[PDB]
Amino acid sequence: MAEDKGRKVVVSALQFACTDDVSTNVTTAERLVRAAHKQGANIVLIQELFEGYYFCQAQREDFIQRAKPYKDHPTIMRLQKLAKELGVVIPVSFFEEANNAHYNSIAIIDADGTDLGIYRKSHIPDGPGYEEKFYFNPGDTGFKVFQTKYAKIGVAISWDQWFPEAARAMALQGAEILFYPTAIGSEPHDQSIDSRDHWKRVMQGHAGANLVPLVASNRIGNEIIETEHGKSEIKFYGNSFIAGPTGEIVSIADDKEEAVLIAEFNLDKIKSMRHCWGVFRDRRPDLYKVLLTLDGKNPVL
Amino acid sequence: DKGRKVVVSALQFACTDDVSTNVTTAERLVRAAHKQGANIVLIQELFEGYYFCQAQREDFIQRAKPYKDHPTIMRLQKLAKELGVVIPVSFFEEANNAHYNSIAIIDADGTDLGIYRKSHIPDGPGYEEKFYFNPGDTGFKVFQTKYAKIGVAISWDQWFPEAARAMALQGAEILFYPTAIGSEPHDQSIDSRDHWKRVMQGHAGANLVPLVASNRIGNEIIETEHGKSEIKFYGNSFIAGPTGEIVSIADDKEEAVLIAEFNLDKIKSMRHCWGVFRDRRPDLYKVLLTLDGKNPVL
Amino acid sequence: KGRKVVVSALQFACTDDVSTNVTTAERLVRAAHKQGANIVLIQELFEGYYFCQAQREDFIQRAKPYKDHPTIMRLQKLAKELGVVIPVSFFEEANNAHYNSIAIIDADGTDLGIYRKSHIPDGPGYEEKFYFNPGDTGFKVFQTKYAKIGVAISWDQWFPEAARAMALQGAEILFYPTAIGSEPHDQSIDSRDHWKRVMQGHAGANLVPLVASNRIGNEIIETEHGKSEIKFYGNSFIAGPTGEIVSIADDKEEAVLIAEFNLDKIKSMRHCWGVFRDRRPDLYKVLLTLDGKNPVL
Amino acid sequence: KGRKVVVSALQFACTDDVSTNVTTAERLVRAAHKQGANIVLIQELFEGYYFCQAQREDFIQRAKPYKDHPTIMRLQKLAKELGVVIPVSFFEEANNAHYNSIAIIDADGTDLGIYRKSHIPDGPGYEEKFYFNPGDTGFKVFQTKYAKIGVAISWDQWFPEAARAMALQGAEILFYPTAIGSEPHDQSIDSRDHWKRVMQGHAGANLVPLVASNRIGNEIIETEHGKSEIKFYGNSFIAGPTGEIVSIADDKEEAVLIAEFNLDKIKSMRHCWGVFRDRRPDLYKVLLTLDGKNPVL
Amino acid sequence: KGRKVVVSALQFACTDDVSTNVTTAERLVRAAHKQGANIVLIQELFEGYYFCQAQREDFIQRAKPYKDHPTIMRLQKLAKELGVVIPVSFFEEANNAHYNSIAIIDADGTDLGIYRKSHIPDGPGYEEKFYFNPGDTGFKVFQTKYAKIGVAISWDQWFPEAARAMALQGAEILFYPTAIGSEPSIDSRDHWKRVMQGHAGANLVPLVASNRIGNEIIETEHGKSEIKFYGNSFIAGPTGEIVSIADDKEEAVLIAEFNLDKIKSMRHCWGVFRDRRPDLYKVLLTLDGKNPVL
Amino acid sequence: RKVVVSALQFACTDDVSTNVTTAERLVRAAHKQGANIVLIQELFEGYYFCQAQREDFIQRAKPYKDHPTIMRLQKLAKELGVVIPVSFFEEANNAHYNSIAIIDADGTDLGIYRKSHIPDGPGYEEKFYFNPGDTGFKVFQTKYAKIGVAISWDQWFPEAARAMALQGAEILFYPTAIGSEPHDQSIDSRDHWKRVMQGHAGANLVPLVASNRIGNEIIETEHGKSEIKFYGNSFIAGPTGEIVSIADDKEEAVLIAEFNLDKIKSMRHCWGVFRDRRPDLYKVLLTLDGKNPVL
């Protein structure tokens, strides 16, 4: 009796705490990637801006200079080594310097060690605790998919995950799995804001509407940043998870543990399911021009 | 709790294949909803009869009727005006040689505010809608009622984030989806109800607007061109709030009246402060105007 | 005297094995070339059975990318070896979209592009809407070594708008690869005469010849509700520029049909007759509605 | 000899009451009119305190739609009465988008349309990116009774690209209503000389006059993390077409600045100077990057 | 703390004898170095009188090729001897085309490449196109031992786009060798400085300008033309503030130290480059404000 | 801005290459007489073929794209530095037009205008050949000036001149081929033709240029020989309508008038008639029958 045929891929969401020291956090990442591969993982997802604290609680001049070029990046070069050694795909999130522009970016490292390129975060959040608009130009790559040894994947970043347009754009270009490294928690100006359920439901919705699985890796722990106006704290709420192509959660972490989440998907069965459900056959792009507005009337240039 | 408040309702009932029975059933539940305080009441898809799209039959097409002087619409305008409630009326539209799965929005004073024509048309065993309906040519609309600016789409439209975003971008404060979905006659292992909820809950959370879904219940057996075909409609009518939470839900067999109050001033303030509309990137969305990921449609 | 072009319609039966059917196509293309053909037309979805009687998940996966398609690549070699133009019908996968498509191969083997079927039929026996996104190429014409040609697919042939669109853009000949027969739900529907008249109208109205290649044979497909059967009724034909039939096959024979046209003299006939001079696009806005009143977005 | 135009920059301190502040605008506009002004410029967001020191939910709901805006409508009445052109800065709600916008009223009261602020500043004291979508009108010029003018907003004034965009589309005069002062996290920043120089640069590069109107006063805002204070530094000015300052206000008093320009003489001095006939747009592609290599989508 | 760099603007009067002028350039480069200069700017076309003033067929001879240029080669030796970066303005012959050009020499004497003057006035009061084709290099930056630098030439000075183009590409200091004066009505010295302070301010990069001084009489098609070049060479900082300036009549050696790391951090925090909108800048690739050029 | 303009008036054979030799040699004399903008008569590539309605004549038409004649008149436009409008019979897929291409002084081809008003009747069976044009009226900005180019029968319609002058036209231009009628030798149209055009100039305050064919022409039709005598009277009119240079009905002519156009924009702008117009009252000009707007 034969196994069910089709390409299988094992994916992983990792969840951990960071210090504001880069060598410590990269060592933490190698360790969890290694544990993930030991559980059979093929593609492994590390959370947003893992090289340090989530520094965007402050709006500081000196924190802008934590950016580094994409070219010859020490963290990327090191994880390229790991990727080739274990035979796994590793997206690497980093703060990019590009002449006078800066971006929250992610380089996709393939399972032979090859850097396949970058995605630059398109949607940039703002407000207390999450002052990203001060640091990052809005991304200019557009939504991208990457052909890896195991799959065509879509990778976007954190706040991108709240936007249906991004998931769909990746899916229309052939993405077979979506990946969202993330940094999200409490909000220092209002301790009654607890966004964790809202956060999951919106992404489950992307998974179900595009009929693709979806991986989110989010940070844990409390971090305190010195700001222009005193110290500010966020408690990162974990809840890393993996969802299947109906938006079912197949694996989930809690709000405090370090975790290695693992799941297997038959990409050929899911392809077949995605097409028979028919949503991509029935879409109406002739009726979607209003999505190219911000205000419901006026197309942007 | 200061601000403009509005009470919405999802209804859920079984249909026969006789229009008079079904409209009497609708009148009964609209009155029950109003009794419980409702301002806007949502009746399910194609509620005038059995869900006839299980078959592909010449005679079934001639069930359509013109938007103009439609008797079912005209009768609920009288009810809308009597109770001062907004009532969207789903009907099978004939428009010269075109046909549409449509919906007419009656305001609380009985005024017909216009129509929306279903945009996304499903197909497959049990749900052969592409055989009857021209794909919709109104575009996604919003309507200004006495109580709120609302966005109404139809059934299968509910699977498409593009449709919810289009209504929200145009100022819709609450979304409405009358529906008819159940089992599928070619495969008894398909159970879409959780998948169906999750995708709608995602629209509500991504646009931060409340969302109302009225779905049919009961078994319906149609005589098709190839023999009997049966669907069991699974109910699960629900109301979701602006973060995607279910605040009110029905099971898969009970007749129901569901009721929720929403404060639109607070929800507006919340939707804006969360920031997604401030942060969208239409400059990077051109690929949504493709089907194949490469070629923009004409 | 003037530019002459010999066209051909092919009519044959299919199994559901690709290699068999392509072998068949190749055999008939060669036979037409031996009789002088420059442009040879193979029927719709000739790679296998007309599977659209069913609405099946597994049949959707018969589709294949346009890129490096093994059937198009095979027939490019044949085009080249023969110096003929060969429109190649295939079921296209393009990411999550799917189309009933056709690639136009020039007489030097060059893939000149594609047209994605625009009008998608539906109903018992012909459940095409389940399988194909409505085409997004628009109507096209293709400059080949012999002629500017307009190629659309099957059900497109019932629409005068398609023919007109092609002719306005310079098509000098129209081609319609086709799959059409009886209807499994009503044995009394016989569409063959109706089908011809409508196509003859297009030919007469635009003053351009027209070529239609249709399938033959009984096909029995297993569907969600049991067996379903179509007898395909052949009647592949070539019409001239006043819509007269110059060549026609019966409803069961395998056939190779040949006809020669003087394209310069037809052009001059088409201009002289006046219609493209007298068209009133100022008064045709209603054709951009479905319902006779509301223009589509 | 030629078309003369008298333009004015206004400068004043704002209170927390809308209708008080619009009356303040009315009084200074009347005073500019009396001294002969044809086009009068009011500072940015003059309806109230500069609220952008804070990032607050409730402050967002201070926005109002462009349609039937009561401050725009009141100012239309005044433009018509006095025969002056008045651009009106306001916080726009447009369904779920919000912008920092300006409506250009013509000397007969006619509302010519709006520009939405393109470049949105950020940082302590000036958290504008929390409130405004980046503008989607693009740079505009408006044809008024007296002159084609280019109006942009505040932070837009640091970008040579905006001033050039407007001059290329025919602006004869540039206007920049502004709100700028000290910064709450660093009392060592005094940007007023820098801010002047950058604008004087635009005037001189395009050979067009330029008007800037800036707020004065200390404003304390209750933020999400406590009181934050800006001292607005005035220095409203008018510059000539070589970038010379012809009129300038101090850092704490109300002012009405007046300057006359001969627009036909300046136009002629611009054509002669030839910079526009000598530009190299074939070499300017890199301006469509952020990072000096990748063109934006 | 940070990379500190000393830059210099030189100003002198030219004779119309080449050896004399190159000897003058060398004397003043050495003097800049003696005061600590790391990068030294010589004014445009310094090997002689400013001749674009005449429409003389004979002055076309003065152009020499980029390859093996006697003046460039001599200045290469001096760059390598003193450890200083020297951009060298010259009149380039290249194959039936001619350009107003400049070649960047690094502190080790390496020839890092060439920029060609992009904007060429077809004015009613010059036929400069007579000598120079419009440049085909586009705007460049060169990585030197001390800094990334952008260099442009004479009329380029007027064009905000050229300064922005160099800045987008990492230029940390801009250099503008020029030559400007007028007949013995108005004088453009303030207009010039204001436009240039403008570019430094908008890009938050320091900016060095070297302009000649002196009267010069050339015989021409009509007869005599005379120009009094007005000097005012200057160095400006990253907010456009003038930190050193020359007068209209004497030789000068201007010196200023910049901390390029502090300036980088200031430039990025001010935020102009984070906030640019290239999606709304297309009209800049038109001449007439409506039609794109090729 | 002192622009010089010319009307030309010459004989045609039915031979493309020779006729192009005559335009060549009269354009050259225009330019030697100081001409900036030089006009060439309608369908000058051969005889006025529209006396017959024959199928083979429709096939005289040519694509706009890489047109033999356009391309040669472009080399010459470039070399002399003169602006030259070029009449030709246009093929466009199955459509056909009576069309004109405006060539600037650097040889630059600036775009086409397509004859809007199509004559009909004996000798002038133009409705048989030409689709009514779909370009609209057009003003081409050239190096020398904003110019208004329409074709032949267009000269009869005040709306066409008025439309061109609302769009910035400083000069109007009309290449033409009119003369005797073959059905009725009593009909003399030369004074009537001159006068209608003079009434436009006056009404818009813009100079006007009408170039026209001379010489006799027999065409073999579907019904026998057919003869027009083309009467010239190629003329330049000023902005009051006064004719300033006028050719005869018989001989080859090179006309010239200098105009101070910045001075004529002042005469016009100051006369007040454009701002005096009442477009709220002109809806009736969008009907054919005097009450039903056309769709």
Author numbering:
A (entry chain C): 1 to 301
B (entry chain D): 4 to 301
C (entry chain E), D (entry chain B): 5 to 301
E (entry chain A): 5 to 188, 192 to 301
F (entry chain G): 7 to 301
What does the paper say about this structure?
The arginine route involves three enzymatic steps: (i) arginine decarboxylation to agmatine by arginine decarboxylase (ADC, EC 4.1.1.19); (ii) deimination of agmatine by agmatine iminohydrolase (AIH, EC 3.5.3.12) and (iii) hydrolysis of N-carbamoylputrescine (NCP) to putrescine by N-carbamoylputrescine amidohydrolase (CPA, EC 3.5.1.53), with the release of carbon dioxide and ammonia. N-carbamoylputrescine amidohydrolase enzymes belong to nitrilases, and more precisely, to C-N hydrolases breaking non-peptide bonds using Cys-Glu-Lys catalytic triad. The octameric MtCPA enzyme is assembled into an incomplete helical twist, made by four tight dimers with swapped C-termini. As in other nitrilases, the substrate hydrolysis is carried out by the catalytic triad, composed in MtCPA of Glu48 (proton acceptor), Lys121 (proton donor) and Cys158 (nucleophile).
However, GOL does not penetrate deep inside the pocket and presents no direct interactions with either of the residues from catalytic triad.
